[PDB]
């Protein structure tokens, strides 16, 4: 059998409440619902009792009640609410049934009470399934819990004016919450129904509008088992980065989801829609799985008057509620057949009020006010049931009085001024509160306000345990962790949500948002000033970490050469010294000082505007030996000393003039070689000119040596002549030997200074030996 809640009244008001929750495949609905079914039913009863006793609202007509059960199902709700349309269809079809009794008031002994107005449809699917049947018979509907997005349009569900905001504002609040915690990688869970699908689609829209993506979207059916929920949690666990889980499920739906998550030891930061709410039966048995869960609820306040009325309730006195007895049995785990729980009272047990309670209460008042508008529209003179109230049309009432409600909310707190009104589309005001499941007490759990959304989200992390800095970093769900932007650049695939980052080329730093910046040419990639650093230490190439030895030995040899040359020229009083001219000593001293200056200049001189001077210096250093060879071949060829010195000076001048003419002091240098770890600050202007001048000087030296080698025997001079001839010959041989290695090693610049120092040191040692041979002979 079925139970019908009937309360006599002048104008009966329809009602559809899910007193019974979802049942198994055996029956349509099994266990009774405590928070959703009983509390809202008693709230509607209290609202009707208070309105019937209110002299300022419907003083003459009495508001009856015809309340039915939905069993949290669509087909059951439809077959139950079929009586709502039967009551009108009987009168509609009895128009021609006028023979015996009368013309227009034909009665058959059983006339169902006409349902002028009906409120119900707490579930969105039940709401849309019943709204069509209600509008088919011109019956207005006012909801209190269904927030489906497909009920906003008036083309299909024209006779539907809910007192709650739609899913648009809820999705906005969810998106703002997920953006506040920097949650990017998101997983969603839905249910088989309009509510779940529309909520999920709106959530994906607002997430794509907030640079948030969702990998997989899961859905559940109506008839479900623990195994399917465990499989859903396992599929959610397939991606470890999915720390957050969006839920658009029901109350018992979320309860079984939490049970399955706890059975699988799965940890998630659950974020859900208004289906979760502040219910304790949903989190019952799954306290650990619900730890740190964010829940959004519709904005409302508890009612003190309804709480006192609800607590003072007993099955004996409350005989008007057919389900109250079985609710008492299910709540106190007793049976009235044994007559054992008669002494139990609801006052001792703590009572938790459903958040949406006042909602339906307001709805009732709204409907009542609509009725009051009728009393001010057709029969304003009389107070009792007038003849104009017999035909009730839903179109006029809905389009002129239901949608034009604006009144102070009943049982509202004195601190705030809440006003119930209907918007342009017959929805409610968009405002939500946020709860977080935390262990506020020692062992108990409760819900605490941690923020609210009303045309803008406001949250505080002080009341959120996991978001507080004391607990550490908050649990974040991202597909890819933020890598080091200093040397790792992220690629931009065909997405906007996820990305992968790899280290770019070492010689380029990451400045742009797409590709590592090139840092120009000749600049080292770093982060020193703005984007990278510059190392101008290439020109300053002093160094000599391991080359200090050879250069120090060269300077020591040059100093010893200066010393012995000074000692020799100071010994000019010797008869052997008087046999030679004074010009040879002067030019040899000049050459030794020159090579000493070249040794001292190869390390300390820079490379900015010194390369041309260095080329001229090498030219003069080679011209020293050139003049030596010229005077050697001129003395053996035959006032005379003056002519020889003039010829040597002219040759040196021609050599340096040619060396200066062949080189072109222009502009332009190499930017950087293939390798980019070090920059090059070099005189990359003209080296072909340098090597050509060296080759020409070597050729003239070879010609002079070939001319001089003919007169190997010099009878004018003593055994020093053959000695200096052999010295010139071996210097020419060592020069032609060092020429190819000098031409080949030009690739490496660091070796250039070393080989130049080695060459000048060898030349200096050769000249030192040549000059010390007469000194050793006269020693």
């Amino acid at each position: 059998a079925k139970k019908v809640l009937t309360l006599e009244g002048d104008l009966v008001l329809g009602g559809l409440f899910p007193v019974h929750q979802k049942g198994g495949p055996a029956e349509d609905c099994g266990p009774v619902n405590e928070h959703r079914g009983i509390q809202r039913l008693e709230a509607m009863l209290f609202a009707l009792d208070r309105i019937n006793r209110d002299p300022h609202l419907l003083p003459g007509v009495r508001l009856g009640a015809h309340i039915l059960d939905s069993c949290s199902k669509d087909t059951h709700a439809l077959e139950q609410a079929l009586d709502f349309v039967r009551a009108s269809l009987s009168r509609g079809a009895d128009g021609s049934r006028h023979i015996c009794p009368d013309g227009s008031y034909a009665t058959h002994g059983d006339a169902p009470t006409a349902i002028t107005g009906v409120i119900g449809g707490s579930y969105s699917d039940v709401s849309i399934q019943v709204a069509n049947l209600l509008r088919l018979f011109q019956i207005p509907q006012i909801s209190y819990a269904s927030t489906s997005a497909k009920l906003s349009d008036k083309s299909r569900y024209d006779y539907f004016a809910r007192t709650v905001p739609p899913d648009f504002f809820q999705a906005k609040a969810m998106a703002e919450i997920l953006r506040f915690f920097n949650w990017t990688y998101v997983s969603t869970v839905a249910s088989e129904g309009d509510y779940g699908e529309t909520g999920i689609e709106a959530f994906e829209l607002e997430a794509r509008a907030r640079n948030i993506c969702v990998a997989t979207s899961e859905k559940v059916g109506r008839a479900m088992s623990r195994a399917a929920f465990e499989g859903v949690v396992r599929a959610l666990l397939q991606k470890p980065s999915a720390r957050v889980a969006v839920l658009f499920t029901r109350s018992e739906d979320a309860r079984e989801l939490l049970a399955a998550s706890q059975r699988l030891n799965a940890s998630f930061t659950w974020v859900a829609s208004d289906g979760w709410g502040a219910l304790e039966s949903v989190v019952a048995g799954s306290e650990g799985a619900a730890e740190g869960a964010i829940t959004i609820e519709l904005a409302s306040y508890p009612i003190s008057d309804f709480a006192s009325y609800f607590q003072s309730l007993d099955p004996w006195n409350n005989s008007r509620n057919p389900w109250f007895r079985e609710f008492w049995e299910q709540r106190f785990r007793c049976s009235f057949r044994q007559r054992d729980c008669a002494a139990h009272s609801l006052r001792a047990v703590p009572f938790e009020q459903e958040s949406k309670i006042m909602f339906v209460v307001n709805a009732v008042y709204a409907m009542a006010h609509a009725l009051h508008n009728m009393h001010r529209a057709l029969c304003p003179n009389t107070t009792r049931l007038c003849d104009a109230m017999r035909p009730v049309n839903g179109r006029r009432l809905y389009k002129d009085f239901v949608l034009n409600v604006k009144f102070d909310a009943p049982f509202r707190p004195a601190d705030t001024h809440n006003e119930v009104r209907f918007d342009r589309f017959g929805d409610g005001i968009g405002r939500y509160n946020i709860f977080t499941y935390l262990r506020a007490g020692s062992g108990r759990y409760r819900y605490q306000k941690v923020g609210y959304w009303a045309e803008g989200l406001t949250l505080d992390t002080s009341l959120i345990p996991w978001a507080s800095p004391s607990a550490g970093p908050l649990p974040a769900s991202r597909c890819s962790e933020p890598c080091l932007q200093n040397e790792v650049k992220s690629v931009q695939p065909g997405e906007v949500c996820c990305w992968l980052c790899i280290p770019c080329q070492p010689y380029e730093y990451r400045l742009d948002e797409f590709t590592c910046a090139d840092c120009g040419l000749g600049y080292w990639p770093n982060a020193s000033l703005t984007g990278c650093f510059e190392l101008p230490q290439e020109y300053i190439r002093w160094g000599d970490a391991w080359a200090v030895g050879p250069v120090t030995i060269a300077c020591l040899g040059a100093l010893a050469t200066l010393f012995v040359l000074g000692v020799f020229v100071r010994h000019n009083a010797t008869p052997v010294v008087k046999a030679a001219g004074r010009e040879l000593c002067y030019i040899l001293l000049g050459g030794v000082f020159l090579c000493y200056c070249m040794t001292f200049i190869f390390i300390a001189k820079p490379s900015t505007a010194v390369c041309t001077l260095r080329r001229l210096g090498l030219g003069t250093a080679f011209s020293v030996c050139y003049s030596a060879l010229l005077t050697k071949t001129n003395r053996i060829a035959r006032a005379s000393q003056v002519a020889i010195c003039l010829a040597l000076i002219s040759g040196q001048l021609l050599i340096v003039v040619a060396w200066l003419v062949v080189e072109a002091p222009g502009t332009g240098k190499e930017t950087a070689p293939e390798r980019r770890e070090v920059v090059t600050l070099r005189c990359n202007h003209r080296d072909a000119s340098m090597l050509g001048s060296l080759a020409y000087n070597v050729l003239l030296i070879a010609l002079c040596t070939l001319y001089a080698f003919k007169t190997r025997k010099c009878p004018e001079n003593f055994n020093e002549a053959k000695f200096i001839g052999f010295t010139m010959y071996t210097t020419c041989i060592i020069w032609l030997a060092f020429l190819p290695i000098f031409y080949v090693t030009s690739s490496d610049y660091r070796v250039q200074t070393t080989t130049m120092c080695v060459s000048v040191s060898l030349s200096g040692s050769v000249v030192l030996g040549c000059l010390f041979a007469p000194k050793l002979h006269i020693i």
Partner: nanobody, 118 residues
Framework: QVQLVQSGGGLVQAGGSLRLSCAAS????????MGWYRQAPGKQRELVAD???????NYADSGKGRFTISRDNAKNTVYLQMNRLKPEDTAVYYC????????????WGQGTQVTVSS
């Protein structure tokens, strides 16, 4: 969607051998999980046996060792054997099948009453 068909009920003596068979049509549906539930009119449902379809199975609180169940995928059928039954097994047993086609829906079956005497 699909539905489940059961057979093998009736009245048996307490402590006797009872076997229940539950089958269905696959219809290209990837069946991931199948199990058995027990409930009473107006009450809640409780799982008594379930197979993960990967060699792993789970049972109820009073069925740790007994109440063995086996599934064959050639016909997609589940068979559970009953050996020790108390008079508290009057509640009807139901079998469920889990399929994943964008819904993760669970298909149920009819009800076969099982009765036990003294």
């Amino acid at each position: 969607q699909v539905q489940l068909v059961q057979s093998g009920g009736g009245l048996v003596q307490a402590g006797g051998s009872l076997r229940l068979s539950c089958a269905a049509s696959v219809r290209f549906f990837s069946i991931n999980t199948m199990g058995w539930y027990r409930q009473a009119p107006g009450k809640q449902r409780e799982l008594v046996a379930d197979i993960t379809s990967s060699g792993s199975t789970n049972y109820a609180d009073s069925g740790k060792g007994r109440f063995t169940i086996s599934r064959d995928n050639a016909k997609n059928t589940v068979y559970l054997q009953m050996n020790r039954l108390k008079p508290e097994d009057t509640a009807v047993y139901y079998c469920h099948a889990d399929y994943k086609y964008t819904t993760h829906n669970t298909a149920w079956g009819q009800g076969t009453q099982v009765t036990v005497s003294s």
